[PDB]
Design a protein around this nucleic acid. Structure first.
Length: 160
RNA sequence: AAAAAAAAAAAAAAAAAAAAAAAAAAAAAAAAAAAAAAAAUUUUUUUUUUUUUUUUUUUUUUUUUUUUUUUUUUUUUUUUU
């Protein structure tokens, strides 16, 4: 199922969000790139156990609700590049990262802070996921000291 | 049998005045009613024309990366009749 460039942003409060993908078990790859989505409500990826790929790139996503991906235990490739993601939390990207094969979140305003990337930096340090241009297009945007700084070269010894 | 004067009563009819009332018609003044035309405070709805913000489709233009064919400007080491 491919929904590239369809302006689905406001569909996810116009009388309640639409619970799209209701019991769509056999879907393999889902692509919703460049739809301008701003907020993804909880309980929208339920019952998607056999899904393998999610592509939500070229959007503006900064409000990552907890437990968005709960049934995505079989995800193989997650694409979120060229978005407005600021922080990567464990409770949001945990289950999708259990067996992820390729990850793409380049060109994002990452925040090089303890609360934001510590878990992500630890995961990157202790994973074998194939990520392209990890050290080039993953520079942080804030603060000034960490502006334009590689994401992989972050010390988590002062965190947790 | 008839005709007249003082003095006291009673009966029919006509024209009057005052009082107690009762009806019909006509004038106002109050208490209400049903309406066909009116104005004036508040909250909402439809439609037309236009303002602002956000997200995307088509087309056009600028810059950068990469790839394929022609005009080719050159060449170093060689071969060559």
């Amino acid at each position: 199922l491919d929904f590239q460039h369809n302006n689905l942003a406001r569909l996810w409060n116009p009388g309640g969000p639409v619970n799209f993908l209701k019991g769509l078990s056999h879907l393999h790859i889902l692509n919703l790139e460049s739809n301008g989505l701003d907020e993804i409500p909880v309980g929208v990826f339920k019952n998607l156990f056999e899904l393998k790929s999610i592509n939500l790139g070229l959007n503006n996503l900064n409000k990552l609700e907890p437990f968005i991906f709960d049934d995505q235990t079989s995800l193989r490739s997650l694409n979120l590049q060229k978005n407005l993601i600021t922080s990567v939390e464990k409770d949001v990207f945990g289950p999708p990262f259990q067996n992820l094969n390729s990850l793409d979140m380049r060109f994002n305003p990452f925040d090089c802070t303890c609360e934001s990337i510590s878990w992500f930096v630890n995961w990157i340090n202790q994973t074998h996921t194939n990520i392209s241009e990890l050290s080039t297009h993953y520079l942080c945007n804030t603060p000034h000291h960490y502006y334009g700084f590689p994401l992989k070269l972050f010390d988590t010894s002062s965190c947790k």
